[PDB]
Ligand SMILES: COC(=O)c1sccc1S(=O)(=O)NC(=O)Nc1nc(C)nc(OC)n1
């Protein structure tokens with residue numbers, strides 16, 4: 001189950017821009033300590049890894065990690081089982097995994113000075129944000145409170161340290177620049193399928209509207225809904241009657257309609273409440289967020305699309321967290337992704 | 350195919366690090382976003398590790414450790430897309446580990462809710478960062494004597510400059526002790542292994558070996574900081590500008606330094622390091638004196654009974670290598686010399 005035969009593998013950087021410091025660089029002057037004088041800095045570039053099987057079939061898959069993550073989540077589970085990278089190379093697809101700008105091997109744009117500041121210009125904010133272990137526990141629905149697990153959980157219990165160690169902060173890079181890097185990758189690859197997660201859900205939807213080479217999207221537990229500009233439906237607050245979900249992203253309808261040209265599937269795990277849950281903020285957040293996504297998919301279908309919502313429990317899989325592709329039943333989750341690719345001819349040459 | 354690779358298994362994991370905690374308690378009924386330090390536990394300073402194991406490995410696993418401001422990408426592929434040492438050594442029947450050290454790449458960058466690196470009143474890492482420029486890295490890596498210029502003999506993959514410089518970035522001020530600690534813990538997990546280091550990781554790998562008997566050999570590409578027994582740093586001249594110096598050598602207790610005499614150690618240097626003072630080109634002159642300091646470090650190890658050697662690639666007939674010989678155009682020939690070292694000491698046998 002672990003063996004993999006690669007026709008080729010490797011990695012590369014793509015995307016990004018340059019910014020410059022004042023003055024001119026003099027090679028006769030001390031180069032250390034590093035200074036901004038005469039400096040050119042490459043910023044906001046993306047890291048890309050690929051593994052190609054012998055005799056690929058169908059389209060390459062681009063796996064795009066969620067917020068605060070890296071391509072690690074597609075390589076292995078926290079307990080060391082094969083991730084989707086291995087499983088899909090075995091399924092005869094070329095697999096790309098990225099570390100988006102600002103994450104992992106992608107660039108973090110900082111210089112000589114306070115974090116993110118190049119002389120007088122703020123490239124990214126000096127003040128950061130980052131989830132705690134406790135916040136991520138409830139966000140990912142391991143259980144209702146830190147330390148607790150839902151009954152029949154598919155989380156790899158005992159590997160909490162491994163799991164939380166994979167997560168971290170992201171600097172305040174413009175989402176436009178993150179989308180731009182992936183558009184450039186899609187142009188380089190050719191026709192492909194995006195597989196997104198959490199924060200990358202909305203970003204992958206945006207990429208597809210700019211890149212006809214995106215031939216399909218599967219989004220695991222996307223975090224932000226998307227609608228045509230001025231056509232956001234009524235969405236209730238959370239059960240605390242104070243909080244809201246993430247403000248839906250609005251795009252021009254001419255771009256939104258591109259989403260109707262390709263098959264799109266949103267995948268949700270288990271333990272999202274049907275009814276208001278005022279005691280557990282992130283559980284209720286998921287209830288309302290999933291509802292908003294259902295309306296987003298309906299809007300795509302009203303433009304002639306083929307957009308679906310797969311709740312894993314309806315397919316017979318119980319206990320999944322917000323990372324179904326690293327849960328204990330991730331082979332079964334992968335089988336459902338293979339089913340989607342096959343139905344839509346994305347596994348054929 | 351030169352590009353084909355057969356893996357018995359591959360994967361990645363996190364190892365090492367500690368935790369820090371914010372004030373107060375976490376209440377799951379209160380808004381979790383925007384994220385707060387209240388009731389927060391943060392995992393910090395952990396390391397990312399990738400492994401690829403061939404079918405029927407022969408010899409010891411290799412642990413490739415990137416230089417300063419880099420990641421494991423440099424062992425995966427060259428900037429022009431040719432196979433890196435990860436592929437070459439899995440093809441040479443070694444299990445290959447590649448790391449992103451704490452503070453780099455997929456390793457942790459310890460920051461929270463607040464100014465960079467600050468957890469309430471505690472500074473975990475500095476808010477003020479440092480970072481090389483393209484121009485500084487060009488001359489540091491000896492692509493040529495000045496930015497935009499190549500040595501005539503260069504092995505650099507010209508035309509892929511943007512790709513190359515895009516792989517580099519800043520490092521937060523994590524203590525070197527905590528970086529060494531993470532790799533010691535990895536070596537404990539792996540068992541007997543060989544460290545292959547580069548530039549800033551050279552001195553760190555030397556330190557790891559003094560703490561971890563599982564390190565059975567070291568090959569260091571263009572190490573940046575020399576190491577000596579405490580109180581026994583030899584006289585090292587200033588640079589040709591008469592004012593600058595090389596990196597202050599790291600000093601360790603002699604009982605630890607002596608552990609370096611128990612394993613084979615090779616330092617590998619590329620080309621275009623001047624023999625004579627060169628005041629017009631600061632980093633060329635810096636490499637001249639740094640290489641000299643390393644020669645004295647290796648001699649100190651050998652006087653204690655060691656097996657330490659310096660390989661200048663031009664003496665092996667390879668001309669034009671930069672400070673990243675393992676991504677240069679002749680990196681297959683560089684890899685052959687690494688295979689030769691492993692074979693000489695039986696590190697390629699079970
Ligand atoms: C891995 O988990 C995530 O990725 C998820 S899932 C629910 C929440 C989160 S998260 O951490 O909160 N990330 C984000 O989705 N980040 C984010 N945050 C804001 C305020 N706006 C936007 O864009 C609209 N994205």
Ligand SMILES: COC(=O)c1sccc1S(=O)(=O)NC(=O)Nc1nc(C)nc(OC)n1
Pocket residue numbers: 032416417418481489547548549550572573574596
């Ligand atoms: C590939 O890049 C490097 O790795 C190299 S090589 C020559 C120089 C460099 S570098 O940038 O300067 N790195 C470091 O070696 N980092 C570093 N820098 C200072 C000021 N002190 C200490 O501590 C001993 N380490």
